[PDB]
Design a protein around this ligand. Structure first.
Ligand SMILES: [Ca+2]
Ligand SMILES: [Ca+2]
Ligand SMILES: [Mn+2]
Ligand SMILES: [Mn+2]
Lengths: 582, 295, 356
């Protein structure tokens, strides 16, 4: 409560520098606390309302602060004092601050008494809903659901009218905004108002000229179906959903595929069986790749939530034949979207069906031309491993892993490198030593530096799974052998490997088995190796005992400080000083 | 206090890797320091192997980052850039500043040669002037960089045997000594030996011809051989000309063209490439596509 | 508390001025006039006695009620200027309080008319325009649009003291008396800029109703703007109310905003204008769908000229380099303002002439 720095913070609300403006805004709580409730009302809030800011971060942070200001303005009796600055912010050009302003208005609404909602909050929504700019009408949309439950019947009827007006606005941006809020507004209306008022609106927006509006009707579907009795769904929701699923716009068909599981849950197992599965099959056979891909991504979840009584059968007779087609879809994104979820069907179908019907699909995708498809299969073995031994698939995984490891394109090589630790844990240390070790060592001498770097980082992760003993036995000798490579790019890689290995191999292995090579490399003919010796000694130094630093490391670094190359002098000096050897 | 400036330069480099320009005064300071370093370098700058040789970048900052992903980071890997850092792309500023900041920080780890686009007249029409004006609001940064370009070496010689330069041969130069006698410290002329080193192209025609570009010459296999044998060279390594493969051998391997701006101007569809020369000067090539930016 | 943090919000405005000395000076100036009444012809002198720039003379005469009978008494003029001096503490506040409707504290388009009328009657650069005429009225409308274009950055249609203060408008009012060539004042008052603007309108409004439709607007600069974009002008993205969306016609005033935005796309106002037009769903981000929707037409237009268009993906990549969005997956208003090549971005999606 020392007040001068607070007087400074207030002053800096209007500083030329955005950074100071931002700092003050973020400390508005501190300022209001020191002013007390009266002055934060009579000075602080009007002061803020009349300042023009044009910076997103500042406006955002202001809108956020005001949402928390209830106690600071004197409690619920005075919350309505926050309406005017928030009403402006819900009106600026930048959409993101408008959204924050409505989020804060929504938070503050709960602090309004019912009569304060009617006296202050509702007129704000009306002014916004009646605004000249679509932009303020957009804001209004997010504000109905918070004030509706707690006002009188007469006010509720006005709100329903205002909302109907937004749904049929001459500007499509506003219709879109209303569509997006239909579901949440429906969640607060009386059930018979949902039936008589929400359904017509829902049906109108579902047949809008703009597909931007139409596509939002599938999410409204989800919310409306959740609220409605199951036996009202065929009458009130299904005809609109069926229309959405075969809409001329791929974007709306897409949304039904994207939301398919939620529809499945809301609509219930009976409607799912008779209506949704034929719909799902159609989505899988859609003329547009993006829709088939979205559908493909849902096969697991969809099959998983069918009722127990119909599950196996509808999968076998209805879904599986579609899945077989999709495995040879001409579009790669579709094949790879399926690849990433398909083996998740393994436990759902049990051992026998997996072997007979899924395994061929698994192998086919594993032999696929597209690396993304093979990568998606290879990285999702966890589910099939429960039902069938992952060790039983080794013979098929091996050639696929090798082929990706040596792919002409380095980002493909990077992708398989990143899954290597996962694969090493699932296949076991024995299979790894036998079949994969040489693959991992070959990447350390890849032509592409990014691959070398990823491979050196891979070794650390391998050590964390298999231990420092395995590292000393199977990894380190091959790493040190590279110190004799005629190409300096490869000799440096030894030092980079030592860098990461000493984080996990411990003081003894580092000291006895890695450090002698580092010290020896200080006499390398190329300066880049010599200065990376210095850098490595700095890096690993804290794993080394103080005696070692003193008797072995210090003398080498001292020698390096008298090299003819400027960078080796510099990094030797740095090493000496950060290790406290100077 | 050399300690403190080193720390400052490391953060400039770090900031530039996040694709953020330096301020006008930082650029001014960086350029004074680079002039002081470049002024000690020869018109035929001696470079030791191992070194990785790169061609044109033309402000393609995101592809320069990709290049570093392929060749390794400075200072760990040594680089020789053959010019054309600036113009055409959207990030000429961040591109030249990164490279001269690396030269100033690591003068033995990197060599930067002059391209035909590091020139007052060419930058005024091919984008670099305009980029600097937008990013700084006045013409000073442009002035500082174009004054500095005057100091950039014209050619390099790696290990006595591999001659690197941006453009190509000139009928006004028979010997490396003739190059060393030139005065490099001026704007690139429209004609003469200096111009030719930065403008000429190798050709399928025999002897010398006139460049279709409007400056410099074309030269054929017979010219490259005479020049190499007379100067004790293994190879002329050069840039300047887009090649679809990123690199291209010609003249019975007396000449190689290396071009390091993939999908040049979002239009040309080429791979990019760099040339690694290892500890005993053996060559190898690394081809690359533009970095993804996806979202 | 109330000592350490002194009062910092002044509904009034804060600051020192010797009002009685100004009143005294006004009084002896009026003592030069017959019946101590000033005509509009005397208001230059009066303006100077108040310490105002010459071209405040119109607003000063009008504020005092002068136009009613064509003269104003010393008593009435003094009464209103004292009130200004007592309650307005900078030029912006003074100017708004002269022109505004009572208790408004903001200026609407109509409030600027008396000022501009005086400008048109007085400035030597505009003498050929003194008479009532079509050009006389259009010039006034055009200048006022250009005032709101630069000053009214909130798009509210109400110019505020704060907004006035943040602009160069008053500086320009002051310069009117220093520049005899009105084309030297390029920001608001330029006659030649008005003439270009009006000609561009005139040649589209072939029935001369002061109303232009999508077919008309499509003809502009040999159909340089794409049809998908022309359509968005009529969507409610850039106009107040419901009239435009229902009629598919815009007024002359609206056309001035379109034309100025189209001539110069680097401007904070213009960037806002075109972003509103491009953001089909109004969610605050240009999505891949929204960009593709405009770009397919550019492609069909380049085709017709036997020029091969960049495929959408190469174009998108270039545009992401060009704008360098804050967060991946979204191009936003802020990204477009910060990038400084918004004009190149916009032309790529909807202007054939200028993209080439
Ligand atoms: Ca008309
Ligand atoms: Ca959008
Ligand atoms: Mn060149
Ligand atoms: Mn070039």
């Amino acid at each position: 409560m020392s007040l001068y720095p607070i007087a400074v913070l207030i002053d800096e609300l209007r500083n030329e520098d955005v950074q100071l403006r931002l700092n003050s805004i973020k400390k508005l709580s501190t300022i209001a606390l020191a002013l007390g409730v009266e002055r934060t009302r009579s000075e602080l809030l009007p002061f803020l309302t009349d300042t023009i800011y044009d910076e997103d971060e500042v406006l955002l942070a202001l809108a956020e602060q005001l949402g928390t200001f209830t106690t600071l303005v004197g409690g619920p009796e005075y919350v309505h004092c926050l309406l005017p600055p928030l009403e402006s912010l819900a009106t600026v050009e930048e959409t993101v601050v408008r959204d924050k302003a409505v989020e804060s208005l929504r938070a503050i609404s709960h602090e309004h008494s019912p009569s304060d909602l009617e006296a202050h909050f509702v007129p704000l929504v009306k002014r916004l809903a009646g605004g000249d700019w679509f932009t303020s009408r957009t804001s209004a949309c997010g504000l109905f659901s918070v004030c509706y439950p707690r006002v009188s019947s007469a006010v509720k009827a006005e709100l329903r009218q205002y909302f109907r007006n937004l749904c049929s606005d001459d500007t499509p941006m506003v219709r879109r905004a209303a569509a997006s809020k239909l579901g949440e507004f429906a969640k607060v209306l009386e059930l018979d108002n949902v039936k008589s008022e929400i359904i017509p609106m829902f049906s109108n927006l579902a047949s809008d000229e703009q597909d931007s509006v139409r596509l939002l009707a599938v999410e409204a579907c989800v919310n409306i179906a959740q609220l409605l009795p199951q036996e009202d769904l065929e009458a009130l929701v299904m005809p609109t959903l069926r229309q959405a699923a075969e809409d001329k716009s791929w974007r709306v068909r897409y949304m039904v595929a994207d939301k398919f599981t939620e529809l499945q849950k809301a609509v219930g197992p009976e409607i799912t069986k008779t209506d949704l599965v034929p719909a799902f099959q159609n989505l899988m056979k859609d003329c547009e790749a993006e829709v088939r891909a979205a559908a493909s991504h849902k096969v697991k979840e969809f099959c998983e939530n069918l009722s127990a009584d119909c599950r196996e059968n509808v999968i076998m007779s209805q879904i599986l034949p579609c899945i077989k087609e999709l495995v040879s879809d001409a579009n790669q994104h579709v094949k790879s979207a399926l690849a990433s979820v398909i083996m998740g069907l393994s436990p759902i179908l049990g051992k026998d069906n997996t072997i007979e019907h899924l395994l061929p699909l698994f192998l086919a995708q594993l032999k696929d031309e597209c690396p993304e498809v093979r990568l998606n299969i290879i990285s999702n073995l966890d589910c099939v491993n429960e039902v069938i031994g992952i060790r039983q698939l080794s013979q098929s995984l091996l050639p696929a892993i090798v082929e990706l490891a040596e792919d002409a394109k380095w980002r493909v090589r990077l992708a398989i490198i990143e899954y290597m630790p996962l694969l090493a844990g699932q296949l076991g240390v024995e299979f790894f030593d036998e079949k994969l070790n040489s693959l991992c060592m070959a990447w350390l001498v890849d032509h592409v530096y990014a691959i070398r770097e990823a491979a050196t980082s891979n070794l650390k992760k391998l050590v964390e799974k298999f231990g420092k003993e395995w590292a000393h036995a199977t990894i380190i000798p091959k790493v040190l052998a590279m110190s004799g490579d005629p190409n300096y790019l490869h000799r440096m890689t030894t030092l980079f490997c030592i860098n990461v290995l000493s984080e996990v191999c411990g003081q003894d292995i580092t000291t006895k088995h890695m450090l002698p090579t580092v010290l020896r490399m200080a006499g390398d003919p190329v300066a880049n190796v010599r200065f990376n010796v210095a850098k490595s000694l700095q890096k690993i130094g804290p794993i080394l005992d103080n005696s070692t630093l003193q008797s072995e490391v210090k003398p080498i670094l001292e020698k390096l400080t008298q090299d003819q190359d400027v960078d080796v002098k510099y990094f030797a000096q740095e090493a000496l000083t950060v290790l406290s050897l100077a | 206090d050399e300690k403190v400036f080193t720390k400052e330069l490391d953060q400039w480099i770090e900031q530039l890797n996040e694709c953020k320009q330096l301020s006008e005064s930082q650029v001014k300071s960086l350029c004074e320091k680079a002039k002081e370093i470049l002024t000690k370098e020869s018109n035929v700058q001696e470079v030791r192997c191992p070194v990785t040789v790169c061609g044109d970048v033309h402000g393609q900052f995101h592809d320069l980052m990709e290049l570093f992903r392929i060749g390794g980071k400075s200072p760990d890997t040594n680089y020789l850039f053959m010019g054309d850092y600036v113009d055409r792309g959207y990030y000429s500023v961040e591109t030249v500043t990164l490279l001269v900041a690396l030269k100033v920080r690591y003068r033995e780890r990197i060599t930067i040669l002059r391209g035909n686009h590091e020139s007052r007249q060419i930058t005024q029409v091919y984008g670099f002037y305009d980029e600097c004006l937008r990013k700084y609001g006045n013409a000073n940064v442009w002035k500082y960089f174009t004054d500095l370009f005057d100091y950039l070496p014209l050619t390099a010689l790696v290990d006595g045997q591999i001659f690197c330069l941006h453009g190509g041969l000139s009928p006004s130069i028979d010997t490396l000594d003739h190059i060393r006698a030139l005065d490099r410290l001026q704007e690139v002329p429209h004609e003469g030996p200096m111009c030719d080193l930065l403008w000429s192209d190798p050709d399928d025609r025999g002897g010398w011809g006139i460049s279709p570009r409007g400056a410099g010459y074309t030269f054929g296999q017979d010219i490259s051989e005479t020049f190499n044998h007379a100067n004790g060279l293994t190879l002329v390594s050069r840039a300047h000309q887009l090649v679809m493969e990123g690199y291209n051998w010609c003249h019975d391997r007396n000449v190689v063209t290396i071009f390091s701006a993939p999908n040049y101007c979002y239009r040309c569809g080429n791979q990019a490439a760099i040339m690694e020369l290892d500890d005993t000067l053996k060559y190898s090539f690394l081809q690359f596509d533009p970095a993804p930016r996806r979202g | 508390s109330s000592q350490s943090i002194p009062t910092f919000y002044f509904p009034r405005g804060r600051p020192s001025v010797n009002v009685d000395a100004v009143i005294s000076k006004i009084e002896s100036t009026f003592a030069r006039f017959p019946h101590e009444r000033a005509t509009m012809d005397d208001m230059g002198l009066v303006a100077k006695a108040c310490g105002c720039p010459l071209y405040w003379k119109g607003p000063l005469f009008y504020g005092a009620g002068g136009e009613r009978t064509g003269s104003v008494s010393v008593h009435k003029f003094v009464a209103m200027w004292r009130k200004i001096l007592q309650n307005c503490h900078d030029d912006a506040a003074k100017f708004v309080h002269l022109l505004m409707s009572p208790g408004c504290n903001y200026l609407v388009q109509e409030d600027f008319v008396p000022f501009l009328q005086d400008v048109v009657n007085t400035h030597p650069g505009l003498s050929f325009l003194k008479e009532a005429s079509e050009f006389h009225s259009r010039y006034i409308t055009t200048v006022i649009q250009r005032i709101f274009y630069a000053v009214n950055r909130s798009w509210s249609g109400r110019i505020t003291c704060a907004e006035l203060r943040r602009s160069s408008f008053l500086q320009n009012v002051a310069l009117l008396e220093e520049e005899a060539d009105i084309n030297q004042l390029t920001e608001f008052f330029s006659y030649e800029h008005f003439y270009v603007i009006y000609c561009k309108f005139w040649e589209l409004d072939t029935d001369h109703d002061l109303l232009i439709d999508a077919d008309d607007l499509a003809r502009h600069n040999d159909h340089a703007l794409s049809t998908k974009m022309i359509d968005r002008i009529f969507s409610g993205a850039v106009t107040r109310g419901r009239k435009v969306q229902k009629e598919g016609k815009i007024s002359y005033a609206d056309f001035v905003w379109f034309l100025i935005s189209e001539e110069d796309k680097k401007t904070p106002t213009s960037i806002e204008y075109w972003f509103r037009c491009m953001d089909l769903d109004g969610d605050g981000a240009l999505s891949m769908f929204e960009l593709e929707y405009f770009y397919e037409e550019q492609c069909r237009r380049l085709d017709s000229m036997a020029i091969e268009a960049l495929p959408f993906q190469d174009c998108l990549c270039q545009m992401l380099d060009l704008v360098k969005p804050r967060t991946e997956g979204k191009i936003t208003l802020q990204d477009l303002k910060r990038c400084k090549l918004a004009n190149v971005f916009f032309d790529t999606f909807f202007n054939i002439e200028k993209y080439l």
